[PDB]
Amino acid sequence: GILSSFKGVAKGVAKDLAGKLLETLKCKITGC
């Protein structure tokens, strides 16, 4: 389903988006 894919992944996008694009520094800082 689309909703399944979104709620599975999109639900935590607010923080994790930065985790991906800024992996070089957010994940090092926050510990993603």
Tab-separated table of C-alpha atoms in Angstrom:
chain	number	residue	atom	x	y	z
A	1	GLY	CA	0.000	0.000	0.000
A	2	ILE	CA	1.083	3.646	-0.294
A	3	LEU	CA	-0.242	4.610	3.159
A	4	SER	CA	1.657	1.589	4.554
A	5	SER	CA	4.918	2.782	2.985
A	6	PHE	CA	4.316	6.372	4.144
A	7	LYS	CA	3.202	5.700	7.739
A	8	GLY	CA	6.076	3.179	7.930
A	9	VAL	CA	8.738	5.637	6.694
A	10	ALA	CA	7.249	9.156	6.588
A	11	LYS	CA	5.947	9.043	10.198
A	12	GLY	CA	9.393	9.958	11.646
A	13	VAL	CA	10.531	12.203	8.770
A	14	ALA	CA	10.489	15.461	10.793
A	15	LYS	CA	13.731	14.494	12.574
A	16	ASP	CA	15.108	11.707	10.360
A	17	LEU	CA	15.078	13.835	7.152
A	18	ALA	CA	17.862	15.902	8.706
A	19	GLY	CA	19.437	12.609	9.821
A	20	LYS	CA	19.807	11.620	6.127
A	21	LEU	CA	20.827	14.907	4.481
A	22	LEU	CA	22.956	15.949	7.472
A	23	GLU	CA	24.234	12.442	8.317
A	24	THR	CA	27.778	13.870	8.179
A	25	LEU	CA	26.979	16.073	11.243
A	26	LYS	CA	23.511	15.474	12.818
A	27	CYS	CA	23.926	11.691	13.157
A	28	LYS	CA	27.415	12.275	14.600
A	29	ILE	CA	25.986	14.866	17.028
A	30	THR	CA	22.590	13.389	18.022
A	31	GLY	CA	23.562	9.728	17.484
A	32	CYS	CA	20.782	8.833	15.027
